[PDB]
């Protein structure tokens, strides 16, 4: 308690401490972690002043790395001609951390995190080659990114008249521009985002498991403002979220197995070790057989 430490703690000089009646090293695992520090026993330490970096391993410094959460390469064309559930120039991405396993593992390190989502939407254009179209320049489309809370009706078209944004939060940013550095706040009715939720969203028995109703931030409906071009482009909208203002609670085992589903934590490892169900760590030849040995 009451530790306001900014640097790594310095070790003090240790002597021959061979004392009867008390012992530092023989601790009890069956309470928690142990208190045997370096000059207490097992080594005769030297007084070294420790000036090592603790700011770089802060939990805010750990978690305010803007990583990908949704990469949608939606096809921008006259979708009217022929399109069925084909991202008609707009996708209604329900805001979930869980789509990309790097930042998903970073936020699933902790049970609870209160943070503000610095959402940066980097959008890249590519001319689609299925129609054998020429390059003909990469256009500077103004791309609307409307964040709708839950309960608000998501749009169904590109010109769906729900993009008026009378009260909905939206940004209007072009592609030949810096990306939309927007900050979605702590959009939770509870005091933290329950990244893990051992409960059901609905009061009914048939509700989906693991999705916190408090953590339904909503949908980030991203659309193309201007009308369809005669040449089709593949607009790839990559939304990157930087957990800013980090307050984390209850650190957890990291997810060792490869992720399977967004909505739950269902697991199946690789076919052998490493990161397998029956063997998380890659197996050695024997218990005493030592790998990566200089000889």
């Amino acid at each position: 308690i009451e530790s306001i430490i900014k640097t790594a703690t310095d070790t003090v000089k240790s002597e021959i401490n061979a004392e009867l009646g008390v012992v530092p090293s023989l601790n009890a695992v069956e309470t928690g972690a142990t208190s045997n520090t370096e000059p207490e026993e097992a080594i005769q330490t030297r007084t070294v002043i420790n000036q090592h970096g603790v700011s770089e391993t802060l939990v805010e410094n750990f978690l305010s790395r803007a990583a990908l959460v949704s990469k949608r390469s939606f096809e921008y064309k006259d979708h009217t001609s022929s399109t069925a559930q084909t991202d008609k120039n707009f996708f209604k991405w329900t805001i979930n951390t869980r789509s990309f396993v790097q930042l998903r593992r970073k936020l699933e390190l902790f049970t609870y995190l209160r943070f503000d989502a610095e959402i940066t939407i980097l959008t890249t254009v590519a001319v689609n080659g299925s129609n054998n179209n020429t390059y003909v320049g990469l256009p500077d489309l103004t791309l609307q990114a409307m964040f709708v809370p839950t309960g608000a009706l998501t749009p169904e078209k590109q010109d769906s008249f729900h993009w008026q944004s009378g009260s909905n939060a939206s940004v209007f940013f072009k592609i030949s521009d810096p990306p939309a550095r927007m900050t979605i706040p702590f959009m939770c009715i509870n005091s933290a985002y329950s990244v893990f939720y051992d409960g059901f969203a609905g009061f009914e028995k048939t509700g989906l498991y693991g999705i916190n109703p408090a953590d339904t931030i909503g949908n980030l409906c991203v659309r193309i403002v201007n009308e369809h071009q005669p040449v089709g482009f593949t607009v790839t909208v990559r939304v990157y979220m930087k957990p800013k203002h980090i307050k984390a609670w209850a650190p957890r085992p990291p997810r060792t197995l490869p992720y399977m589903s967004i909505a739950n934590a269902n697991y199946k490892g690789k076919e052998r070790a490493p990161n397998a169900l029956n063997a998380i760590i890659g197996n050695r030849d024997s218990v005493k057989t030592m790998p990566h040995n200089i000889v």
Binding site: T31, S194, A265, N266
Partner: protein, 236 residues
């Protein structure tokens, strides 16, 4: 090792070969303060009636026992006055005083990482479907571990020690005590459709002995500490 008496309500637990208890996250359980509260309803705070230690169904420990888990308050959803208050109230706040006794002889070779997972979002092997009610809310009988090594959620038992935990290593520990406070993002939340704590007892080292094989029962006694209840409704 260390004697320990836990006297709450009419129930009292005396253990002679326990270690120090596991006051979780440096937090003794407490009621909702006038600042942290979110429900204007007066809480029931049915102390003594719901702070009793509730001895659950003791699961048998064998050599092939993978693991057992209990979700709080799903393990106590239908047990005692705490179960009646949970069914009769929509909002609840209660810490839990875990005491797990594994009475084994001094010739017994085994250990149990008795771990208390906050929000154990359990996974299912080889299918992307979410677990249902019959795979999550088993109730007072609890649920076994099909894969305790992955902690049944894709994570890792090895790192489960970041959680409120002790060990019931049968060398010099027959009983372990974890003092869980209230832990949720919400100050109060629905008991019958959420598990704020999940106590999991995993035979990390399986019971062993060349002595008379005797059912080593894993007696689980969870006392719901500092009980609070809002939203008095019908028995859901």
């Amino acid at each position: 090792d260390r004697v320990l008496q836990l006297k709450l309500g009419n129930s009292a637990i005396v253990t002679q070969e326990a270690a120090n208890y596991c006051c979780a996250y440096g937090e003794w359980p407490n009621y909702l303060p006038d600042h942290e509260a979110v429900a204007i309803d007066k809480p029931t705070q049915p102390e003594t009636a719901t702070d009793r230690f509730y001895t659950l169904r003791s699961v048998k420990w064998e050599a092939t026992s993978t693991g057992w888990w209990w979700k709080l308050p799903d393990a106590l959803n239908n047990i005692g006055m705490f179960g009646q208050n949970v069914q009769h109230h929509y909002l609840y706040r209660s810490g839990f005083l875990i005491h797990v006794q594994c009475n084994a002889t001094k010739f017994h070779q085994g250990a149990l990482l008795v771990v208390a997972i906050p929000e154990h979002q359990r996974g299912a092997h080889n299918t992307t479907t979410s677990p249902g009610f019959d795979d999550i809310m088993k109730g007072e009988a609890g649920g076994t571990f099909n894969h305790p090594y992955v902690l049944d959620d894709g994570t890792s038992l090895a790192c489960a020690t970041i959680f409120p935990h002790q060990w019931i290593n049968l060398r010099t520990n027959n009983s372990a005590t974890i003092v869980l406070p209230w832990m949720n993002a919400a100050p109060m939340d629905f008991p019958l459709r959420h598990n704020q704590w999940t106590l999991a007892i995993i035979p990390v080292v399986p019971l062993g002995t060349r002595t008379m094989s005797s059912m080593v029962p894993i007696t689980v006694s969870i006392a719901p500490m500092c009980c609070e209840f809002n939203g008095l409704r019908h028995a859901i």
